[PDB]
């Protein structure tokens, strides 16, 4: 009816965070609706969010991470529906970036390597990354690899010969934190020689 | 509920204390009857990070808006959270505040996986 989901991001602007809500029927009417959120805030007691088209969104550093919060669907000052969440458990990272294979000569095997600024932030920094490739030959049937570095090796011995394939990342949190994944970094393309 | 001081309150008090690493070594450091008064002790270390977290906020500015006192508010209304006057300038007293709040914090840690 009126019901909404949402993810945090902290320190993705600098050390600012920033919560996004958006309704899950995407014909909702919003021409008339408002996003609020109370509680487990500092200097103030609550926060408007921002339309931006279809989503609502705030950036704050006022966000407390101790305890939970309750986001409201407001509509002039009647709350329509409100949840209490704790955005320490709707955290989405930020997508990994600067894929990038290299195949070793002698080990026969790939190095796939990439990065994430998740690094060196002060909160979200463990994060669980998903490495998903596939051939292009084939459809929907990728394989996956959940690692905790940046760093995976692939043997060509396991890999098709001869044949291009895709292979990308994406971070879900994985300490202390709870949330989504992250969209996909970008795909990068290689190939495997002829056995 | 530890978990919550490690992981987020802890990074407040880092920050503020990356700020004041360069204060330090010149105010005369004869404590402060603050710490001669109320000490973390023994299992009574509740008592302390209450009147720590409550005096923390003597140092918020009326314009609360800027990362410093955000990290100020955040440390004490969490500190507050998690368990239950005057203004003040000198960041000698705000320094050795911090540490001791964390010192403090290290007790009950430590002091949990033994109970």
Redesign the interface.
Request: avoid cysteine; glycine fraction near 6%.
């Given at each position: 009816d009126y019901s909404f989901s949402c993810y945090s991001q902290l320190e993705v602007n600098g050390?600012q965070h920033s919560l996004t809500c958006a309704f899950e029927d995407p014909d909702v009417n919003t021409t008339n609706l408002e996003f609020e959120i109370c509680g487990a805030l500092?200097?103030v007691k609550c926060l408007n969010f921002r339309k931006l088209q279809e989503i609502y969104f705030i950036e704050t550093?006022?966000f407390?991470?101790?305890?939970k919060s309750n986001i409201c669907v407001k509509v002039g000052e009647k709350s329509l529906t409100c949840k209490k969440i704790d955005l320490?458990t709707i955290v989405k990272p930020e997508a990994p970036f600067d894929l990038s294979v290299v195949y070793r000569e002698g080990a026969n095997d790939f190095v796939v390597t990439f990065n994430t600024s998740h690094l060196q932030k002060?909160?979200v920094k463990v994060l669980m990354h998903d490495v998903a490739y596939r051939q292009e030959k084939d459809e929907n049937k990728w394989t996956h690899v959940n690692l905790s570095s940046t760093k995976l090796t692939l043997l060509q011995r396991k890999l098709q010969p001869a044949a291009m394939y895709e292979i990308k990342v994406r971070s879900i949190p994985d300490?202390?934190?709870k949330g989504f994944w992250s969209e996909w970094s970008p795909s990068y393309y290689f190939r495997t020689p002829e056995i | 509920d530890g978990?919550?001081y490690?992981?987020?309150?802890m990074?407040s008090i880092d920050?503020l204390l990356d700020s004041m690493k360069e204060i330090g070594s010149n105010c005369l450091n004869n404590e402060f009857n603050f710490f001669k008064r109320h000490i973390c002790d023994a299992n009574k270390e509740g008592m302390f990070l209450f009147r720590a977290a409550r005096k923390l906020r003597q140092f918020l500015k009326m314009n609360?808006?800027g990362?410093f006192?955000?990290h100020l508010?955040?440390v004490s209304?969490?500190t507050t959270?998690?368990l239950n006057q005057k203004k003040l300038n000198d960041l000698c007293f705000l320094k050795r505040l911090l540490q001791e709040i964390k010192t403090c914090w290290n007790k009950i840690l430590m002091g949990t996986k033994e109970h």
């Open positions: 050390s500092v200097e550093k006022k407390l991470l101790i305890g320490t002060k909160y300490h202390y934190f | 978990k919550q490690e992981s987020v309150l990074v920050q609360s808006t990362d006192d955000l508010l955040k209304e969490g959270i998690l």
